[PDB]
Ligand binder design. Sequence first.
Ligand SMILES: [Zn+2]
Lengths: 89, 54, 665, 236, 225, 702, 63
Amino acid sequence: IDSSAASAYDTPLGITNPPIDELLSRASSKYALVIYAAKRARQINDYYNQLGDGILEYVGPLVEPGLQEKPLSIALREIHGDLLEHTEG
Amino acid sequence: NSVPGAPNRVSFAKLREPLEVPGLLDVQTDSFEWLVGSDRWRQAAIDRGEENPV
Amino acid sequence: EVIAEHPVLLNRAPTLHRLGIQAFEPQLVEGKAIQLHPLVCEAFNADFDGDQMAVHLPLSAEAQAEARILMLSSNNILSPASGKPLAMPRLDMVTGLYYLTTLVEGATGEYQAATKDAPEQGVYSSPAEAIMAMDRGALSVRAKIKVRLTELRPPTDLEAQLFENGWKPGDAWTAETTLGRVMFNELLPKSYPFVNEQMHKKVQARIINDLAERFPMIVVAQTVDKLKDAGFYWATRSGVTVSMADVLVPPQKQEILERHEAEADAIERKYQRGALNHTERNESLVKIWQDATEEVGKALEEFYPADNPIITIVKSGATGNLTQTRTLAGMKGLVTNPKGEFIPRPIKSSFREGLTVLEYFINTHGARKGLADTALRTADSGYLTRRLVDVSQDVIVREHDCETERGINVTLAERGPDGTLIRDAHVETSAFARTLATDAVDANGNVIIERGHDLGDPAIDALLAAGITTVKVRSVLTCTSATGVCAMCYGRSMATGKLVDIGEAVGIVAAQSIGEPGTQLTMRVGGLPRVQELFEARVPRNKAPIADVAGRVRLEESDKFFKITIVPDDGGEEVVYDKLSKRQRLRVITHGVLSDGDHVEVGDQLMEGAADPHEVLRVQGPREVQIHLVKEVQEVYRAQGVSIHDKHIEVIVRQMLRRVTIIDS
Amino acid sequence: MLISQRPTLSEETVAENRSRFVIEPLEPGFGYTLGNSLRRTLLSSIPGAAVTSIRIDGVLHEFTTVPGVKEDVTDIILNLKGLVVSSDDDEPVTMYLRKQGPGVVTAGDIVPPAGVTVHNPDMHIATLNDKGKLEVELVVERGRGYVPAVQNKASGAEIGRIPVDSIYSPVLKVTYKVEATRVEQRTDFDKLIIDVETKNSISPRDALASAGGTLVELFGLARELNADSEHIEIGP
Amino acid sequence: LISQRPTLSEETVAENRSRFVIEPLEPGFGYTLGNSLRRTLLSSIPGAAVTSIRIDGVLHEFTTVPGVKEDVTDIILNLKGLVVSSDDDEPVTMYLRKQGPGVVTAGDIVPPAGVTVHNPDMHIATLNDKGKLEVELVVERGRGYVPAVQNKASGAEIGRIPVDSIYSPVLKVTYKVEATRVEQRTDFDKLIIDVETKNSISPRDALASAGGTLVELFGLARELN
Amino acid sequence: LTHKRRLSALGPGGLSRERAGLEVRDVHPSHYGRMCPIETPEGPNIGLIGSLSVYARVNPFGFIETPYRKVENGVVTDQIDYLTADEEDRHVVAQANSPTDENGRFTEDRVMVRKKGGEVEFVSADQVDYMDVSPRQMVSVATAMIPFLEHDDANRALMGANMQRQAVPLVRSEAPLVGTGMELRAAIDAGDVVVADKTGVIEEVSADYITVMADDGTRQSYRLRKFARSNHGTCANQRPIVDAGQRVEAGQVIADGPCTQNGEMALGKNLLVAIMPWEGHNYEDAIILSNRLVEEDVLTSIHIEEHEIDARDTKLGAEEITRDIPNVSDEVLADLDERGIVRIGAEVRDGDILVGKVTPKGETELTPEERLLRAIFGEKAREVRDTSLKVPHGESGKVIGIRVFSREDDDELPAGVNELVRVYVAQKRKISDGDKLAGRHGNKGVIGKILPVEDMPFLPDGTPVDIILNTHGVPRRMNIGQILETHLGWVAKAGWNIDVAAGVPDWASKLPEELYSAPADSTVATPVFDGAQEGELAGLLGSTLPNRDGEVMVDADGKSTLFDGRSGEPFPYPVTVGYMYILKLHHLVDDKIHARSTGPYSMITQQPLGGKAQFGGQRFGEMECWAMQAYGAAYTLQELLTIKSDDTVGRVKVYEAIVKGENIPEPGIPESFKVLLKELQSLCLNVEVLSSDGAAIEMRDG
Amino acid sequence: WLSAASFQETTRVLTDAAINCRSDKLNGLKENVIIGKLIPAGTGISRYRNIQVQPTEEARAAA
Ligand SMILES: [Zn+2]
């Protein structure tokens, strides 16, 4: 059905790789999405900069990262994959 | 024509010029030579009608 | 490695609205100049004649997330002021999309009906065959043909007659169109129905608005990129060039000029005989030469062919006017004095023929006056924008719904000739993007649209079809929220197209939306000074007193002033007014001089001009003064063809009616 | 001279008969020449067979509708122009298509003579009505490219002939695009992307090979003036 | 269907001009062949040009030589119009040296064995009774346009003056089609391409080099399947 | 030349650019022949600055006079009277274009005149008592060099004059094919050209001196400026145009100037132009250039920069110029001579040392780590600080001159200064993307693409075009004069021969007899308000002579059939082609590009400086803050305000976090707020920050 | 008083505020911009600043 499959686009390029509409459907608003992605990226960055010999608490990237992929891109990919949950204040 | 050594540039003008373009830097030189009081300024003032130029 | 997926913010001063700062993904280039996308210029108001831009680099994770989501250029395509798309084909692109989609009669290899000896000629089994035929010079992209399409949706009308269930990809149908329209519809999404129209700029804007309303924004961005590429490709093959031979002059210009010059000579001779004033002669000459200008313009417009390179640019909506075309080839017309007054002697020579010395001198008069006025207008607009921003900044969406039954009455249709209910010309900025406060009920009461429904074009169509002329919407003027406003009262956000998010600064957006079209607000009291005196709650320069009570009207005449006495309809102390300027006119009462013996209303205006909003507030009420302020501001802004939704004006007016004076502490 | 780096060609299947070849890296400015020459050669160089004219029984003077079948003359012509067919002879040959009674006259009902074969026997042509007939005579020739409908070569000796446009080229649609790449701090090299869709009688790779062979023949004819001149050597 | 293969023929217009005719060709095919040949001729024909000069008493480009009417910049601009032919890949050095009044032209440059100058009448400089000119030029080979290479890259001295080098020996290439070839159908093209060079190489050699480059490219296009 | 002829309304005893309304910035009808109504700045000084007209003089009382020819009984005499505005108002002045007979009698009865209050009117031939001298009496020198001025709108003519004043000198100059005749006089009166004083013959001509004999028996020696820096960085060198033995006359031009060819003003180059859209690379006033311009150094200019450094006397000691430079490598000091200055001809890059200076440092307590490192490596710490003169950021070139002044050699240096040295660095700049080109008709634009030669559209002869200009920008700006110039330009670089067979053609009735035939590359003159007409232009387009192949490339309409460079197929429609004279303006990307990550800061408020010359930052003003607030981007705005401008600890913490790879820390308190609080307290205002409890928060952290 | 002083008529506003002994509450766009705090709009409101992000139980177990 054309109406059912109306979300048929070409392959997104670069900074638009996770479609913004799907991410907006994942979250409540756009600001909630912004804070969601920023906090997940901070958690990933802290995981990468972990001492290793101390205490491990922050979970690593739940999806397989690229070669030199930014933590924010990984956070957005995790959000798009329904691998995280958030609660607003 | 007036300039001794000039390249040939044909013109589309159809009107004769009764008066040629004056010196384009006279607005400064004439004023300063009036200020100093040079001889040529004195002669120009005398030939234009003068009483006692200063 | 380090710049990959790291957005940067680009800004061009002055920053008039939000779209003056936009986030982009950078790519290294070998030059020293920033390469900017051609479709983001209108948002930046940028042209490539020496402009410069500033680049800023976000650092923290929150900053990069905001740059990617909130401020990305691919997410901001619609204006936050009117909702019209800004990242749409303009200038060269339009020309291409025009030349591609126009239909030419008698072109090469066009469709021909079957004869008694030969079958139909010009029918192709696929667009690939049409392309293979046009590559051999046997076909034109602007020739009508019949082509079998299998990957393009029927235009919503043939689909309901050919495919009973529906159209699925691969189903073949025969379309009578041009190859250019087939290519253009190949640019559009697959589920979008076939258009089959010539792409004027209005048509392209309508299509892009439809895509934005019906499709995800990523699809809209990709479609806009495809349209840009196709328009750029077909603009260079459109054959639009400027030549002295393409600037044609009408052959009957001399006759019109001679006749009007004979009339002018007759008027001048009559003036020399003493039977004329100076003002009368000036007015007669101005009228004569204006009529001559109109005649020359009409003759030029009718003389030019439809495929002229000069006419094509104007007609396609790319850029330009017909007045500029008339000035280029035709008659310059009447010019103004240095103090703003028409000169009786016109400029009868066009810039193609070449102005003379004195005509050029007068043209310099007018041109320098305009150039010098532009800078002052820009400075005044900037000051007004700063004041508006500094006023409405505590107006922020704090809740979702204040649960209020109070609203604003908005009119959709006024009378209708015999009951057709002709739609109001200003319903897109008065009734769209608003939520109904009460259920719509017509004669033989039946709920058409329920409470809380976001009004759109289908909703307005349904309401008009049901015979409903007025509705009650929710506005920020009547909102019972403690701090800030709520999302339901503000309504749809003109940028996203959905309900406004909680926590958005709508005051800053409203102030910027009002203040951005200030440079193009030419004064004709009117223009920018009228807006400034409306927003400052000042008494008007040409103040027109309004009636204080309704009833009998008594007129008293004298020298240098008039006098109006309002005898109460039910008795009481008759209201007496004061001296009035003679260089003004009384209000026209329908068919119209207000001599005497009239029954004025409670707040009926008497003279012609502007009434001070303070008297409107004191006599009638806060709702009436809100209506007056919004209507006056919109009247000023609509004289220049500027579309601003009423919600911004309503926010600003709401911030002006927040206080009461204490008299009995 | 020696090129900085040898160009490479890679295929990318998109459909049953559709491919997207990529050639990279290319010296700056060679992408456009290569792409345009390859596109023109693919579209107008490969020989092939196609239906040249048709003759429908029962339709002699008025070419509007055919009795006994739902489709009209135009629909039959459009269906027949989509018939892919390979041939062995060069001179024109005649084929027959006879159907009796109601039913769908698919392309498989055509009886192929010696040396002629069809590759899409499941192509819909017409739908006869109850107690209906259809006898169509086709003329198949061999050529290259796309030639418009040649008018009747007689003053009325044969009147039932219906000339049609001949799609001789096995390749249906070619589009070339040139992008920019980078090798080593040199972001000016060109990359050529050719999207080619052909019929089912040939594969896009074979079409590309034939086009390359013909272009090599042409430019070797140009080169034969001086075979020992100084040109750019690609390498291995 | 035509079984006749295309053929190429040559006619001579001048000493450095020629006109080549290719026929028959398929309809709509002459323009693309002509454009491919024109682009290859204007882009990828190897040649020789000077890459550096060193004058006796000067240290940089922005100076003047005593007794010479033209400063160093004008001398370089004049030298950039030389047409030179070298048969050696590695750089070679030519010497120019004149004294006293006269007109220093390109005919006063004595080149080594294997290097030739094809215009020994172009104007380089003019010297009075007190003017002496002594320069040495470095001639290399290449193709296309290469901007000057600075001395900080090759580690040269201060007196060396790098010069932009244009190695392309082709002046002007154009083409036209006739679409008049007839065998049984009257819609077959005929390409006519006019080539004019800088007298360094004959137009036949330039056309052969372009054909070789295009053969290599379109052969790698088909062999890698 | 225009600077010396400028009339300014600003200064002591004059108006100010803010206290001046829309009353003095107007073209008064009394400016005719005294002040140019076209040439004025288009910025905030519009109407407050102007230029003298060509024929305008100055009264002894300070009023501006203009000449007029006195006419009597309809006969125009040869007596010229200089009148001011007051004297002009009393009389009625005719127009210089009025048709006159052989004696001066007006052939036509009705004459266009100007009455008292401007009042352009028609009167009889007997009322006239004065006439103008030339049709271009109202225009200035810059405005008189625009061909087809009457076909351009006032705004575009203003822009054209202003941009024509901004051209840069190229390495080689070329006079325009189509001009106005105000090129010899402007160049000669400018003074940058060298003019012989007395008639005679040339004896010795060189690149830097010319010796001229005379009939009197006196030798005149002229020294020519060679590669001399002007006030704005351009190169101003003169070259002789005479030969030994040539006999010159008093007043004849003897050596050209920077923008001068054969004594005529030459500010730009003649380029083959095609008027057409092209793939969007010339979208929105952009320009596409051919690569032949870069290869052949057509639009190439020399720019000279001067760097000066002085070694003075300080209180802690004396400053010495030497090649010691305590803490550097050894290869940095390779281009410096024995006295510590660079060598002439040595190429310098960004950051290279030009003059090696050093200053006394005094006693400073070194860090223990630095002391240990110096002990390990043996580098003794010397009490001198390196203050060498280094090439600024984004600059390079070649050293062409060194000037040294020393007090010990009796040089009039200022007090305290002991030594001074100046270094001149010269750079040749080619045309590139982002450079601004313009024309004489107000058409400007930055180069957006430089295509190869084989990608440009070419004529059927094979000649590529040099520049592509967009079509959509011409009609809506009312400056179609350029188009006419384009057509005329082609004829100028084509030669023409009017077929006088069967009599003179009707359209060529008023053409002078010397314009009936011209050779190739000939130059023509089109005076401002009296020049070529449209009918004559069409006739000359139809009468052009063929090329070397005997064929015509441009038809009578001024259009040609161009081919596509990158496709080969001819364009479906003919395209307007011709020759246009374009100018390279002094707005180059090399002087515009600037970027910074961290640099110098201010003193009172710890905010970054501003300007390219100081490695400053970009201002994020109040409007940008409004845009960020409307977007809803709280964090971006907060970080921009705090940790990029004022947070003193935050800046270094952010840099350390970025380098080490951790997260960006939270912002602190901007220093400007604390400065504001101190400034408020100094006004006897008790400003105090209160916490949630109600106490006072001290701002003395540290 | 901070926004009023930043807007226009600084001296009069400061005099009136000093005499009245006014106390700014520091909740608005202009004041928060001046002092360096997050503006109370967009992503700077309490609802969006206090988002708690954590992996879901299924993703936690899978990883
Ligand atoms: Zn509400």
